[PDB]
From a paper:
Titration of H3K4me3 or [name] peptide (residues 1-12 of H3) into the ASH1LPHD NMR sampl led to large chemical shift perturbations (CSPs) in 1H,15N heteronuclear single quantum coherence (HSQC) spectra of ASH1LPHD. These changes were in the intermediate exchange regime on the NMR time scale, indicating tight binding. In agreement, a 1-2 μM binding affinity of ASH1LPHD to di- and trimethylated peptides was measured by tryptophan fluorescence and MST. We note that this affinity is in the range of binding affinities exhibited by the majority of histone binding modules, suggesting that the recognition of [name]/3 by ASH1LPHD is physiologically relevant. In contrast, the association of ASH1LPHD with H3K4me1 or H3K4me0 peptides was weaker (Kds of 119 μM and 1900 μM, respectively). To gain insight into the molecular mechanism of the recognition of H3K4me3/2, we co-crystallized ASH1LPHD with H3K4me3 and [name] peptides and determined a 1.3 Å resolution crystal structure of the ASH1LPHD:H3K4me3 complex and a 1.9 Å resolution crystal structure of the ASH1LPHD:[name] complex. The ASH1LPHD fold is stabilized by two zinc-binding clusters and a twisted double-stranded anti-parallel β-sheet. The structure of the ASH1LPHD-H3K4me3 complex overlays well with the structure of the ASH1LPHD-[name] complex (rmsd of 0.1 Å), as well as with the structure of the ING2PHD-H3K4me3 complex (rmsd of 1 Å), pointing to a conserved mode of the methyllysine recognition. Like in the ASH1LPHD:[name] complex, in the ASH1LBD-[name]:[name] complex, the peptide forms a third antiparallel β strand to the existing β-sheet of ASH1LPHD. Overall, the two structures superimpose well (rmsd of 0.9 Å), indicating that no major conformational change occurs in ASH1LPHD when it is linked to ASH1LBD.
Author numbering:
A (entry chain A), C (entry chain B): 1 to 53
B (entry chain T), D (entry chain P): 1 to 6
The structure:
């Protein structure tokens, strides 16, 4: 929704597929872009936890 | 943690 | 800071220059990228208020 | 509007 911030490494502002939320900064990211799936317990984005993707 | 799919 | 979400149309996650926060979704953008300055009373990003930039 | 400059 308009209140839900999408900020994925792909840089596309689109709500498709399985997405996951950063526990800290609350942005949403595409699981496929981030190399994860829906069974992880905790998630942080690539800015809260810098890393290669 | 929190996930969704529209 | 780590809990300040930068989501500018330039797609660069960096804190430099004059920056402005969307009134609804809280993301920060570069004024120069968005074509505005701090003399505005109210601001919305290009996703909360679609428009050409 | 809320602004900053670092
Ligand atoms: Zn993506
Ligand atoms: Zn984050
Ligand atoms: Zn920018
Ligand atoms: Zn916004």
């Amino acid at each position: 929704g308009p209140l839900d911030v999408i900020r994925c490494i792909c840089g596309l502002y689109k709500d498709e597929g399985l997405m996951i939320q950063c526990d800290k900064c609350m942005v949403w990211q595409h699981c496929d872009c981030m190399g994860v799936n829906s069974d992880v317990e905790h998630y942080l984005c690539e800015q809260c936890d810098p890393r290669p993707v | 943690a929190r996930t969704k799919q529209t």
